[PDB]
Design a protein around this nucleic acid. Sequence first.
RNA 1: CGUCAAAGCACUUUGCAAAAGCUAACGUAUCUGUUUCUUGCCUUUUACCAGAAACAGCCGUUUGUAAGGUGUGCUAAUUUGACUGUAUAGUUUUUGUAAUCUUUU
Lengths: 82, 293, 73, 96, 95, 492, 278, 98
Amino acid sequence: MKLVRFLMKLTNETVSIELKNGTIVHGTITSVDMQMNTHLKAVKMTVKGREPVPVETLSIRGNNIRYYILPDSLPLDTLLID
Amino acid sequence: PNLQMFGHTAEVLVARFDPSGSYFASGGMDRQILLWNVFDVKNYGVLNGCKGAITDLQWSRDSRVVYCSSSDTHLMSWDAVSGQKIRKHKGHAGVVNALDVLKVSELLTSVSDDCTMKVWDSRSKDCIKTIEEKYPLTAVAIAQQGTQVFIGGIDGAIKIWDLRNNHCSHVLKGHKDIITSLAISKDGSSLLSNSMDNTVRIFDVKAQRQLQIFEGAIHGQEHNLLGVAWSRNSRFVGAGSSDKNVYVWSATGDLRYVLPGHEGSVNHVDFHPHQDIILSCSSDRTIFLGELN
Amino acid sequence: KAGAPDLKKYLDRQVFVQLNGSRKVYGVLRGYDIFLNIVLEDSIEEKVDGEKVKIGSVAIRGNSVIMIETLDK
Amino acid sequence: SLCIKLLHETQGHIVTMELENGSTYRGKLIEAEDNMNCQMRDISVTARDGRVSHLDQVYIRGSHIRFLIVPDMLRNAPMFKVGPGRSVPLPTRGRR
Amino acid sequence: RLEEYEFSAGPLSVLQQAVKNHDQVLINCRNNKKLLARVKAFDRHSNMVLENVKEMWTEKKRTASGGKAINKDRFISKMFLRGDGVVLVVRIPSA
Amino acid sequence: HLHHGKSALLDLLVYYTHPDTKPPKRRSLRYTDTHYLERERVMSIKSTPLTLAVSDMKGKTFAFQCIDTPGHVDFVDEVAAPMAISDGVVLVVDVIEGVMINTTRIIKHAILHDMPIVLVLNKVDRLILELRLPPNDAYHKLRHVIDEVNDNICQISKDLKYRVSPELGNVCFASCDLGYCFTLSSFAKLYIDRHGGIDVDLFSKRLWGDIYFDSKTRKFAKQSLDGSGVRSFVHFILEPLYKLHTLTISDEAEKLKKHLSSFQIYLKPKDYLLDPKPLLQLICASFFGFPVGFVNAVTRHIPSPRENAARKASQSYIGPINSSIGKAILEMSREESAPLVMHVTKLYNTVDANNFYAFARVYSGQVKKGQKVKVLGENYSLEDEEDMVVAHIAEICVPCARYRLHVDGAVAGMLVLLGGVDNSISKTATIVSDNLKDDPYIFRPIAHMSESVFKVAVEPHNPSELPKLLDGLRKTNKSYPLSITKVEESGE
Amino acid sequence: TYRRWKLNLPQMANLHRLGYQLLSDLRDDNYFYLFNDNSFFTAKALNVAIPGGPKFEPLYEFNDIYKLIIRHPIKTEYRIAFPYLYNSRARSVALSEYHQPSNVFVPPEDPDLPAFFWDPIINPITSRQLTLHELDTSPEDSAIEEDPNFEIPFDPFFHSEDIEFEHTASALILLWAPHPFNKRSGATKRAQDVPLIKHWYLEHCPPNQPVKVRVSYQKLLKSHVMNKLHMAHPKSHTNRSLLRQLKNTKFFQSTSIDWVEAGLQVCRQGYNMLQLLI
Amino acid sequence: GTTKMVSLLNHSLNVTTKDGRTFVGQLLAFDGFMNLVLSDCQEYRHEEKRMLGLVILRGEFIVSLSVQGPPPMLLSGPGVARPAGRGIPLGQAPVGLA
RNA sequence: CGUCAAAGCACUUUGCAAAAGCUAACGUAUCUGUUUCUUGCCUUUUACCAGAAACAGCCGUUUGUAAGGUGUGCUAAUUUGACUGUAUAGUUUUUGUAAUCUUUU
Ligand SMILES: Nc1nc2c(ncn2[C@@H]2O[C@H](COP(=O)(O)OP(=O)(O)O)[C@@H](O)[C@H]2O)c(=O)[nH]1
């Protein structure tokens, strides 16, 4: 009975994530947890007021995630079903 | 010397060196791969687990991981340093007969009595590709490029398939009967092949006609899969026979060394990668290291 | 959860609390909570000027609290 | 959980820490908590300014702590398996 | 148990009402950057999946010489918003 | 006293720490008996030492330095020896036997030397199965044991600085067979960790007797029970013990699964179809975990070696406190500069009878291999230097009953096994470093709580081998405190 | 195969109750004191003999009467307890287990009163002899006096289960039983290796028996010592087993029949096998 | 879950915090709150450094995680050899025929 | 109970290896023989009396491993291991006190 369960389907695609911190992060998703803690593969993250730096295995403390900008090819109707 | 080492209980089939030239592996009907040294010629691990008899070993090009092709569909994988199991590549619905490996130790090809070729990754535990022909397959060889895979069947027709296309590009001709072992040179430029007609023919890789039909190495009622090899130079060709003789050729179409020694049918002859030594195996439970000074 | 904190040794003794917004208070420790809500009596402010205003009995919230000290050993 | 037991094990030794306040405190630790409360003595504070002070006794709230700094021998300490139905790690003879 | 009860009657029902009506929504965020879009799905935490989003947010040049208000818009196809960032929702109908 | 469950107490710790160790089937396990004589008889005889890394409530690990003492009345010698080293005494008492002789004989002798006491009521499980007393009448039988301990305290001192009671923390209810020790504080936790928020402390005060609990009002009272007032203790501890030692046993294995699922103990289905006692052990070790209570009940009452240094130095050290050695003891200096002070009491046989390890407390500084060391005696003084002898320290080792830990450098605070320093020593013998400030003093020769008395003559059966017997009789005097050799005029 | 068995509680109950007339009634072990396999070894070695027990072949200036102090003769029982002390030139000796805890379990004779009922054999428990410390507040008063109004909302662990159950009686009787029954899940011996009544000739013979018997009792006991003396610890070996070699050649076949048939079968076979030799 | 988090154990990590500071070192212990324990730690406030040692961070304080480096660090079978020999067979032809 | 991994599963027949590693019933049972010595009763040696030490056999037990057999499933069932295994939007961590501005070097 949670919208979080839909994000566990999301695995594999690339997304530009925004955080409360104000950073921006392009990278492929590997796994998503019930507590929002996502792990990413082949990442290019950029800090607020610094140059972009590539990281291999980024992972994020879910608490900090503002929003995922999902890819345009992903069908929503199919994923919203259990 | 010669060194005729004993060890196996029953018919031994396959015996190969590392790519380096520092070990043997051997194993047939025993259900036991037995590793060896080259230079104090002693045994090592008894790799135990295969519940079917072994039909083909091949060292990983790292000289650590070993791969089998049991008669019970499995293709096992072994850490030659420790001697533990890694996997059971479960796939075929019949007896596997041949294996082959690449440079990149990652990809493997196997050949069933289901008439199915299958390419394997050492990371998935499943088939990447499945090429179904019709009559049970027997011998396979993959090129150094990691592109062309050669299949040998019951029609006498060595078919050639690529990994991109997956089309019947070419079919070798003029072999009347059965193929027991393919073998690509250390160039990537020519095959070897044992037929049941006793014509140990060479073929071309790229125009694609014959080169030299060798003749003088009989197969008979036994129906073992006999082997052939290219020497480290690609000067000599080493074909075994059911006449208890290791027929070494000159590759110019001339029989040089014909050394007996075995009391039973011979199976898979090999060559050492640098120094001139010949691994020769046979149902007999024996193996030789024939040298040239 | 709800580990009732070790404030038994501070009961009926003077304190020097600090809270959020850099504001601080003196008082006799009367009672405490699961969430560290506090009961102080004879409460005296310590303004940024240093002007000390007497208030009386006061209930400080738990969340706010940064720390709690002792004036005399 | 192990990140709490390590703390309890540094009771007695001298500890450094950082709060949301911005200041760092250093002193002998007397008691801790699963909340991350603390009870210390002979503390030597050092704020953003550099201003040193002395505080005889202190209590804290964990919520206010950012991170601790712990003695070096506390890396050889045992890290146990815990279980599904246990609060404290401890070693475990029984089933699991 | 009681979660089922509030979705029909309470405050959150007007999204369920609006999102079923195929409606657009104006959302004031905690980032100081409002979101204007049409919603797909929502949750008890206000975790919302937005489609065809457009932002509205002021700016300054910040002593470029050594500045004035600039508004900027961007279209996003699909967007999962964590409800913590939301502070105020305005469920405006077309009709 | 005898067979009260001392050696089996430590075994209970060992099991939790050393995963490989398993119980011999026929006979108990008795880690820390070692000697084959101690295993034919089965009684412990020579006191052995241990050290192990024991955990606590919350989790903090301390390094205990335990010493099983022989409970047979006649080896009181080897109780007293380490008494002049240890920082406290742990007692073990049988809740069926009660407080017999050696429990008094030691309690009394222990308070004389200001040794703080920790009771451990052992063999409680037994009084639920052997005796099968009902829970209320067993409470009385427990309380009774605690009282009678104190009646032997009262005689030696009327002070209430000592006073053993579970209300305070001194007392520990444990059965070393089934594997569980608890204090009132530990039992409390159990409820508390499973049920929200109350203090452990405000709970454990009220759990001891002459107090009652109303299940209707949810509040305590001294009020004599009106109707179904039980007695806080028997309501929250005993009766939910009693159940365990009758749930497992009575083969109501359907129920146990539902109940033990409450606590999130999950057994495999083989384990119910098992065996009474070793099912019990498996349950009681999965429910009451590590013997944490008993840990917490030592680190709170038996003081750390620094704190006790002050007191311990006063009653044992003969010389002045104002001196440099008297000062170096009080601060527990761990420097190179500091004077090295030991205090050897017992020597231990090694795996062959040839040699003797020494057992001494390092009171100050550091000891390392190959150090020159003035090993004093008993009759020594500042006047004559005839007692003292120089010697080299071969091997320093930390003891663990069966295995030993080879260490390079000792430190103040610890107990140790020394290699090399034997021949000068017979009975007590302080060590002190050679290069020192003048006037190194001795440690008081132990007060044994029994005179030797019994006498026996010993001639060799063949007189040609009289040297060897003579060499042997010296070696006894080393490993047996109270023994005394004394050649008669005749030749005996 | 019929190795390994697991028995219910109530089953083991009946078996116990049916076998009662055979199996013993000691539980302690203290009973044996000078009747252990060890003691009997030392007796043998010291060439002395203890009263109820066996008696073997032998195995193998300083004294002065005027130096001794004759006070209570010193019996044979004394030498077999502390052989190194009271006896000189003590070799080939075994030292015995000095004492065990002592079992305090009396089984319920009248099975109506519950499992946990204060028995009238235990002494009252009165404590008017004692003199304790004194404090003004009093521990219990004080503990409540600090705060009487405080509460505990959760109640104990097993508040629904009662201290007794249906079989909790039967069970306690087992725990403290003689070997085979206490176990409640075993192994599976062979009928030859279940001696039944050996424990009659260990306990040691009840009074008023004729000499015919009392002598037999010893002779039985002797044997039991003499084995326990030389028992070797078994050698490591692979299993030979003749009767499964013969079964692996083509000359023997297998079938199942009645006992008495195969008794006659043998009894005949042997008749002929001698006749043909004669 | 926490299956991924155990995989990180004993690797040198780069941990950004809410303050902006970045801690670095191996990972010894891990929690359900994301409490991390780190060995031989070094902050990089920013051309800056400091040595701390053992550091225990809270969950509130942590932002992101990233691996810097990887985790830090059948006897003899029956077979026997022999020398030579190479006997000649009188007969020719295959093995089964005759 | 829950997850993940491995494996057909339970029952059974043979083969082949092992079975003090830190004082301990491989078997809570228990029998014969050989050699070397000591004593018995004895003169024909065997056959024996009843102690010792040193070797042996025999009747059994356990474990691992290999190949089999019966019954059941290979569109399943069962076993075996492993595990940092629980769900909390209202004060001590994961549904935010954040947002924003300006000056100094
Ligand atoms: N029933 C029961 N017996 C116990 C318990 N603890 C110890 N024992 C028995 O007590 C004896 C242990 O004696 P111990 O104190 O180790 O020897 P000591 O060194 O002479 O004190 C063994 O015979 C155990 O069976 C217990 O908790 N319950």
